[model samples]
Target chain A: PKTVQDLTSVVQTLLQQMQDKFQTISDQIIGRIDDMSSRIDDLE
Target chain B: PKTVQDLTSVVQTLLQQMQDKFQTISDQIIGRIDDMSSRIDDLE
Candidate 1:
């Protein structure tokens, strides 16, 4: 039998990967939004 | 099997990404709330 890995570790690893991917996405989104806000300030 | 070169790096990257995403979400929510506050201030 192929070793049955501890599901907790597997899930944790996957969750971490997902967290990483989403964080990068979020940073990019936030940077864009912040830039937008800065531009909006220029209109005043 | 492709050897995992740096598990620590992988873990760090994942953690960093998660933090970044969370920060972005937090910032966006705060920005919205602040905007609401400013609008209210203007009405006073």
Candidate 2:
């Protein structure tokens, strides 16, 4: 607004939020097992 | 110091670019073979 510095900070927020989003998604998809295994082991 | 609108536009650009890059990562990440590694061969 007043200066380019303000614009630069917005970029920082955008980049940080993007990084956080990717981390959460990666954790969700990669760090857990699904329910298919439960049924699979029951039958075995 | 006209308005924060100037900073707003840059955030829009940054956010858009971030989303674009994240789209590529989403494809690369979410489609990975998330498999259950539990042993199911041993029977009671």
Candidate 3:
């Protein structure tokens, strides 16, 4: 039988997963911006 | 005539848009987490 502790742990794990996903997305966006900046510099 | 200043402005605008999008996603996720946390607390 699952206990309250198990449920809490599951929620905590999910929260961490969500955070990691957000971090990954943010990193990817930043990388794209950096690439764009370099291209703009080249065009200048 | 398009200048380097114009190109820089466009890139800066794009960066702001991306940041805003990320912020929106983050806020939505956090709202969901908070709701879940409250529900979990009620179950405890």
Candidate 4:
């Protein structure tokens, strides 16, 4: 078991990390969207 | 005066309530963000 890879365990961890990373990135994207919206409103 | 201490406590209570309300608003923002990204992907 030392050299062999556990594909199942590795993929589960990767999926969890991806989901968390995506969630954080989604928040930043929306914050930027809100800021842009406010700027546009201020211009108009 | 009827009571100065009571007035201060009331103000403190109101501030604490407002802080709790803002926390809920922050969570709503995160939810809105996740929704927006999904919508954009669908559009593309």
* Top of the candidates by lDDT: 1
TM-score of model number 3 = 0.47
**Lowest lDDT 10-residue stretch of candidate 2 chain A:** A30-39
What C-alpha lDDT, on a 0 to 100 scale, does residue B17 get in candidate 4?
74
Best by TM-score: 1
User: Candidate 2's fnat?
Assistant: 0.29
Kindly list the per-residue Cα lDDT of model 2 for residues A6-35, writing each as its tens digit: 978976886788888878776766544354
What CA root-mean-square deviation does each model show from the true structure?
9.3, 6.4, 26.1, 18.2
Clash number by candidate, in order = 0, 0, 0, 0
Expressed as tens digits, the lDDT of each residue in B1-44 for candidate 4 is 55989976885687567655655676687677667656654654
Query: What is residue A42's positional error in candidate 3, in angstroms?
Result: 56
TM-scores (chain A) of the candidates: 0.71, 0.61, 0.70, 0.57
lDDT of each: 0.69, 0.65, 0.69, 0.65
Give per-residue lDDT, candidate 2, residue B32: 47
Q: Candidate 2, which segments miss by more than 4 Å at Cα? A: A33-44, B1-30, B34-44
lDDT of 1 by residue, A1-44 (tens): 33447755786888878777866776776677667566556644
Question: What residue runs in model 4 are displaced by over 4 Å at the alpha carbon?
Answer: A1-30, A34-44, B1-3, B38-44
Candidate 3 residues lying further than 4 Å off, grouped into runs, are A1-44
What are the per-residue Cα lDDT tens digits for candidate 1 across B1-44? 33466866776897787677777787886776588557556655
| Selected candidate, larger DockQ, 2 vs 4 | 2
Model 1 DockQ reads: 0.16
TM-score attained by chain A of model 3: 0.70
Worst 10 residues of 2 chain B by lDDT: B35-44
